[PDB]
Structures are given as C-alpha cells and as structure tokens.
Amino acid sequence: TRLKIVTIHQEPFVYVKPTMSDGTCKEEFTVNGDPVKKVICTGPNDTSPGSPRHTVPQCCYGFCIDLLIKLARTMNFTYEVHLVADGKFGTQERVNNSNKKEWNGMMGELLSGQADMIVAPLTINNERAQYIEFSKPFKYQGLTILVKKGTRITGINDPRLRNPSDKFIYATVKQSSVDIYFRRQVELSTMYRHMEKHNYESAAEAIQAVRDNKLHAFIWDSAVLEFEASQKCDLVTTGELFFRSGFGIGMRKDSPWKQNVSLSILKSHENGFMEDLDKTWVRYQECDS
C-alpha cells in the first residue's frame, strides 16, 4: 500500500546529506525560522566508495521533498523514498547492441516498477509522455544562460551564439539531455560544432569555469542556474528563457493517482503553496558577501 518514490540529487529541489550516527537527520531551519522537513532517502553510496554499505540511508529535503509531503498528506498515502540507482533522469537508449530500446534513469525505474512515482524536477516532453503520465506542471521549465555579470546575451538567437567563434566560448554538460538534444538538431549544428569543443563533465565545473573566466556562457536549466547565480555577486543569468516546458510528477500510464496529483498541484498553485516553495528554496536571500 506504501508508495515507492524515486527522486534524484538536484539542489535546490532535492538536497542529499548523510544521516547522523543514530540514523537521524540534523535539525535545521529555513530563513523564516521554520523546521526543514527531512525524509530518509536510501541511495547509492557515492560519497563513500569502498564502504560496505553499497546502498545507504541519507537525509533528503528541498522543494520537491516539501511537495512530496504535501502530496502525501493531501492524497493520504504513505511512501518510502530512494534515489535513482544510475543517477539519471532518464533517456531512451538502445541496449545490448540490439534495436531494443530501454529508458534508464528515473524513467526506467518507474516503468519497471522499482518506483511508483517520480517526484523530482522531471521535465515534461513528448517522448517521455509516450511511456508515462505526467501531472499538471508544478513549475515551469526552460533553459537559460549563465554568464559573468556585465555580459550581454539576448538569448538563443544571439549572434555570439548563432555565429560562434573562439572569442566567445559557450558550452553545456556532456551527455546531459541538453547535450543530446543539441547534437541531433539540424538547426543547432553550427552551435553544436562550437559546444562539442567546450562541453564540461559536470554543471559544477562549468559554473566554476564561468567564475574563472574560462567559459563565457553556460547553457543549462534555468531553475538550477538562477539558484546558482543568486549565490554569487559576479554571476548572472541572461537572455530570454528558451526551449520551455514544465516539471511534472511522473507516474505509470493509467495510474489511480494521476488525477489527484494534478488536482493537488492546481490547488497548491491557487492557495500560494507553490509560491511559498519558491520563496523557501529557489533563490538565495542575497549573494555571498
């Protein structure tokens, strides 16, 4: 009767921290002085490779955890939370050198029944929606560009992007959905020729490169980038959001929970719950002084 929830490590939607020796979560508080709600999430012990605990209890919290808690109380279900084993959101890939394709990441865990519900900043798109159901979006999604403050880029149609040169370096994260999407679009091939020269192994490295003036612009999720930029006085996002969609809760097709998850989200938009989440989680009060 208890739902298996899969989520993924992605601040500020889901923070992942160790439990204490007792197996409890450290008591912490929000800017408003409310207790941070924390759940126990088991997941791959990436922090301690070599540990005899391969799958380890950890403390999860953030925007998506508050939202999970709201859903559970509103729809009266119990749950246990785990972090996706391969650390991925989910793409469809050929397996075993055949023509059979399988989803990995959280998409795969949902389809195989290792998860009953995906609660994460999971981007709604047409290909995913062929295989699962999304709720109404709890938050809107798009890409944006991270730059040093002062750098002016209008957005995706900016000439320094559309007509690239070594004078203005931009990039994204290798093997991310952004990377995979860009590399397959005829319309983006000129941009991609530039980007594949500069793509970074991880978002954190790319963000640091922008601070270090080693990368001029980083193309990534706008929620992640706006969160990161708010921490740093010398970092800003710039240009119009682009390639937009929304984040939704994911469930298997014809799930008995789908309508109720959507109604709960619509209620939360209307009553100010979602806006309160945005206030609590999404932006620093001010840049580091």
Ligand X SMILES: O=c1[nH]c2ccccc2n2c(S)nnc12
How many other C-beta atoms are found inside a 10 Å radius of the C-beta of residue 126?
7
Stretch that binds ligand X, among 76-84, 173-181, 189-197, 272-280 (CB under 6 A): 173-181
**Share in percent of the chain as helix, strand, coil (round to 5):** 30, 25, 45
Query: Residues 122, 143, 147, 261: which binds ligand X (CB under 6 A)?
Result: 122
8 A C-beta contact, residue 136 and residue 26: no
**Is 177 among the annotated ligand-binding positions?**
yes
Q: Residue 77, exposed/middle/buried by CB under 10 A (0-12, 13-18, 19+)?
A: middle
Stretch that binds ligand X, among 19-27, 117-125, 183-191, 207-215 (CB under 6 A): 117-125
Handedness of CA 54, 82, 1, 131 (dihedral sign): negative
Q: Give residues 135-164 in contact with ligand X (rule: CB under 6 A).
A: none
CB of 63 to ligand X, least distance (A): 12
Q: Classify residue 119 by its DSSP letter.
A: -
Q: Which is nearer to ligand X, 59 or 107 (CB)?
A: 107
CB of 27 to ligand X, least distance (A): 28
CB of 155 to ligand X, least distance (A): 19
- The reply to whether 5 sits near ligand X by the rule CB under 6 A is no
| Token pair listed for 56 | 């380890």
**Is 128 among the annotated ligand-binding positions?**
yes
Query: Residues 123, 222, 264, 268: which binds ligand X (CB under 6 A)?
Result: 123
Q: How far is CA 81 from CA 66, 75, 78, in A?
A: 13, 17, 10
3-state SS, residue 258: helix
**Is 221 among the annotated ligand-binding positions?**
yes
- The reply to whether 10 sits near ligand X by the rule CB under 6 A is yes
Q: Which is nearer to ligand X, 133 or 221 (CB)?
A: 221
8 A C-beta contact, residue 220 and residue 139: no
| Token pair listed for 156 | 């995706």
- The reply to whether 12 sits near ligand X by the rule CB under 6 A is no
Query: Residues 109, 221, 226, 228: which binds ligand X (CB under 6 A)?
Result: 221
How many other C-beta atoms are found inside a 10 Å radius of the C-beta of residue 26?
11
Residues that bind ligand X (CB under 6 A): 10, 89, 121-123, 176-178, 221, 224
Binding residues for glycine: 121, 123, 128, 177, 221
